Structure formats: structure tokens, C-alpha cells
RNA sequence: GUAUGAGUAGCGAAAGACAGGUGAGAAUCCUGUCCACCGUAUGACUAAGGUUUCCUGGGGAAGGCUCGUCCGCCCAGGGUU
RNA sequence: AGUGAACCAGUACCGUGAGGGAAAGGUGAAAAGCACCCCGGAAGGGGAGUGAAAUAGAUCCUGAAACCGUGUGCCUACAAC
RNA sequence: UUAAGUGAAUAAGGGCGCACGGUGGAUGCCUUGGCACUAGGAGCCGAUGAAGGACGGGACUAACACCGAUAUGCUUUGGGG
């Protein structure tokens with residue numbers, strides 16, 4: 001009975017982190033849409 | 045001269061239905077009888093009503109009255125207090141609520 | 157099986173007429189007077205049947 | 213003969229423990245069903261302690277607990293009595309001239325967490 | 337927001353008993369004695385993961401499927417070379 | 418109602434993530450916010466005091482209904498509503 | 499006295515009316531925040547390091563506002579008492 005979420009520190013930073021969001025043109029669309037809403041955390 | 049004294053307990057953590065089984069055993073009795081009746085009932089709320097009854101008696105003696113031997117339990121009741129709300133997890137991912145209930149308890153004693 | 161109709165106040169209270177408490181045989185101690193359960197030791201003074209029992 | 217909420221070997225363990233207490237202490241607080249079953253077992257031990265011989269001793273030693281002491285004794289040593297040694301040196305000679313009925317039960321009160329009716333069972 | 341079903345179903349595998357302590361209050365906390373359970377694990381060490389849960393002194397409103405004087409809970413100080 | 422948001426709100430919370438997303442205003446003119454005593458481990462209460470008013474005591478303006486109680490004038494154990 | 503006849507009252511609990519309480523937060527009155535516009539200004543910031551953030555600065559400092567190792571502030575010109 002293995003569930004879907006298995007935590008890992010490196011993967012979370014490598015798939016969802018600030019530098020991965022900065023390296024694509026659509027990542028920066030995400031970051032701008034989060035800054036426009038007022039989120040206290042804009043990137044995992 | 046006033047001849048009567050009350051006490052009350054507020055938001056005690058017992059259910060108001062069970063506290064009423066004990067307090068019907070004590071209404072209309074002399075203060076002498078009520079204490080022994082409360083001492084020999086093993087229900088959780090029996091000893092709480094004991095403290096409220098003893099406060100009524102101390103109030104009679106010290107603030108106004110005298111004559112602990114003449115006193116009688118004239119009025120008694122149990123009302124509801126505010127309830128806490130909780131949830132217990134059930135089978136298959138759902139949950140159901142649980143009520144944590146409370147009581148206000150008041151006793152009154154008259155010189156007769 | 158599920159209740160097909162809710163039950164009213166009169167029928168609930170008519171069910172609840174055999175749902176009370178009793179306070180059975182209470183006597184007075186022979187040694188110290190206060191009330192106590194018959195065939196039991198007296199909790200006020202520890203005397204049963206004219207002798208001392210909860211002492212040494 | 214009163215199952216007491218237990219299987220067959222746990223009932224036997226529990227009785228063997230509660231009668232070795234009361235040999236060592238002579239007065240105990242327990243519930244009301246256990247006290248009746250125990251009056252029966254303890255007096256069966258005392259009428260072997262009054263018999264006296266080796267066969268009676270080895271009969272009792274199947275039922276009295278072993279690695280328990282009961283000491284109020286010192287001349288000049290650490291001299292221990294063994295709770296079977298007490299049965300055979302002290303309690304038998306005490307009830308020499310009494311026929312059965314070496315115990316008695318009194319009723320006190322219900323336990324707070326339970327409403328279990330409690331009881332004191334003592335010797336003389 | 338509050339009823340009815342109703343003081344009803346359930347309280348999530350398993351061995352405890354007694355003496356004595358503490359205390360307003362003890363089946364449930366402490367100390368003892370005997371009994372019972374696992375033992376290619378229910379023992380010892382560690383990588384992830386968690387992130388202060390670790391130690392000492394207090395507390396008992398809520399959390400703990402009962403209780404609680406107790407706690408991986410609450411308050412104050414401290415610990416990683 | 419009016420912004421999602423009159424209050425520490427794009428917050429708590431939910432999701433791997435992109436993203437979704439709330440509830441929650443009012444003592445009194447002035448804190449004068451109950452010194453002292455009594456029952457009680459405490460909580461809570463009764464006097465005494467403040468105050469124009471405390472049944473304005475912090476769950477604090479007003480305080481409707483469902484729902485839960487206590488006391489009483491009249492009726493009710495041969496009856497299919 | 500014997501026969502034949504007629505027969506009230508008494509509530510384990512329930513109903514209707516009334517009186518007083520409890521819970522709960524509708525209604526009235528109120529505003530600290532909003533909505534739609536008018537008239538006027540202004541219509542860019544950035545390698546001389548931006549927008550937005552992280553971490554710090556207080557006698558005690560968890561949080562918000564302010565500020566940056568010159569850190570709850572430094573100089574200078576005017577206003578005010």
C-alpha cells in the first residue's frame with residue numbers, strides 16, 4: 001500500500017524551485033502571476 | 045428579612061441529561077437528607093451537585109440566614125451551556141461530528 | 157433500517173418514563189448516627205456491627 | 213465456579229497470586245467476586261498447613277508462590293521466611309483448634325473509575 | 337443555528353495482581369515484588385524523511401476515544417564543539 | 418450588504434504543482450474593569466462595593482424563532498384519532 | 499342485616515393555556531471599510547544596479563509599522579512652541 005507522495009528535498013527544489021522557474025519563458029509568466037496576486041511564497 | 049439563598053455553577057463539563065437524573069432525587073428534601081443521598085450515588089454528576097448544594101448552605105449561614113436545621117431544598121434545575129464542536133474520522137475518508145456538552149447547575153434553599 | 161418519521165416530544169418523553177435512578181436502603185449507624193448503607197461498613201467512623209474495623 | 217473474565221490459565225495465575233498475598237499480608241482490598249473465590253482457595257491451603265507432613269507440604273507447593281518473602285524476623289542475621297514456611301510454622305498452629313472458617317469479608321465502597329464494589333477479606 | 341434516531345452503535349489484535357507513596361481527588365502516575373509476552377525481532381546501529389519532538393523545573397482550560405496528580409500537550413530556562 | 422478582504426487577507430486552510438481560498442465589527446460618558454469577606458483544589462457563585470443602569474462584568478448594546486427546562490388553573494389509564 | 503341498583507375521588511406518565519429561565523444570534527440603531535464618478539497633477543523605473551524580496555537594527559522584542567553595521571535613525575534650511 002504505497003501512496004503517491006514520497007517526500008524528497010532535492011527533487012522539490014529541482015522541479016519547482018526559483019532557478020527552474022527563472023530558466024524558461026513560461027516560468028516567468030508563473031512568477032509574475034504570483035507576484036500580481038500577493039502571494040507570500042511565489043516559488044517552492 | 046429574606047429567607048432564601050441560591051448558588052450556581054456555570055459551564056460545567058457534564059451532559060445536561062445525566063445531571064437531571066441525579067437532581068430529581070434531591071428536590072423537595074431537607075438539606076440533611078440531600079447530602080447523604082448524594083454521598084451514596086456513584087454517578088459522575090452526584091459530587092458536583094454536592095458542591096453547589098454546600099455553597100447554597102454556606103451562603104445561607106454567613107450572608108443572611110441562620111438555622112441550618114430548618115432549611116429545605118425548594119428549587120433545583122439544570123440548563124444547557126455552550127457546546128464544543130469536534131470531528132472524528134470515519135471509514136473510507138469521511139468524518140462525523142461530535143458534541144461536547146456543558147451544564148449550568150443552580151440550587152436554592154429556604155428556611156422552610 | 158432507518159426511521160421513517162421523526163419522533164415527537166410526547167412520544168420521546170413517554171419512552172423515558174422508566175429511565176430514572178433509585179436510592180435504596182439507607183439506615184442510620186448504631187455507633188455514630190450518620191446515614192450509611194445497610195450490611196456495609198460505616199464510612200464516617202469505620203464501625204460495623206458495634207466494633208471498630210478500619211483501624212489497628 | 214465463576215469464570216472471572218479470564219481464560220483457564222489466567223484465572224489460575226490470578227488466584228495463585230491473590231492467595232499468596234493475604235498469606236503474606238493477612239488483609240487485602242479486592243472486588244467482590246474475586247474475594248469469594250479466594251476465601252475458598254485460601255482455606256484449602258490452611259487445612260494442608262494444619263496437616264503438617266511432607267506430602268501435604270509438596271501438595272501446597274504446587275499452589276503457593278515461591279520467590280516471595282514474608283519477613284518480620286531477625287535474631288542476628290538476614291534470616292528470611294518464605295511464605296510457605298509461614299504457612300507451615302505460623303498459620304497452621306494459629307488455627308489448630310478452630311474448625312473451618314478462617315476468614316471473613318466486609319463490604320466498603322465502589323471504586324471511582326469503575327463503580328466496582330470493593331471488599332476487605334481478613335483472617336481471624 | 338438547533339433537533340430526531342439515543343443515552344443507542346462504537347471506544348482500533350494482546351496478562352496482570354497486591355503492598356506502599358503522592359495528592360483535593362488514583363483500576364489508569366511513582367517505587368517494589370512475583371507473574372505473563374517478543375527474541376533473523378517487538379533487541380542494537382544507521383541513510384532518507386520530519387524539523388526542536390531532546391534535557392531540567394513547574395501546569396492541568398483544550399488535545400489523549402475512559403481517567404489522569406501523567407504526556408510526543410501547555411508555560412520558563414537550557415542543550416548540537 | 419459593500420472589495421475576496423471594515424478585524425495583522427491573498428492570511429489560516431487545501432493541492433506534487435500550476436492553482437483554489439475563508440470565518441471573524443459594537444461594555445461604559447469616563448476603566449471608575451468588582452478592594453475586603455464567605456463556600457470551593459480551581460472554575461464558578463453569594464455578599465460588600467463602582468456606576469444613572471451590572472439581568473451594562475468582558476461569551477459584555479438590543480436580544481426574535483427553532484430547541485431544552487422548572488412551577489402551576491383545567492383534562493386524561495374500555496380506547497382506533 | 500340480606501338482596502337488587504346507581505357510583506365519585508385518587509396520575510406511573512401525557513396534553514392545552516399561562517409565568518419565569520437557558521441556549522442562539524435574527525431585528526433596530528451605528529461606522530472604522532467599500533462602490534460609481536468630477537476637477538486638477540503626473541504618465542515611467544533600471545548596469546551610477548530596478549520591481550519584488552531575505553536577513554537584521556529596540557533596556558525587555560514573538561508580531562506589525564519604520565529604518566540598513568551611521569540600522570526605532572545622521573546633517574542642513576524653513577515652520578511650530
Ligand SMILES: [Zn+2]
Pocket residue numbers: 185186187188189190198199200201202203
Ligand atoms: Zn458510624
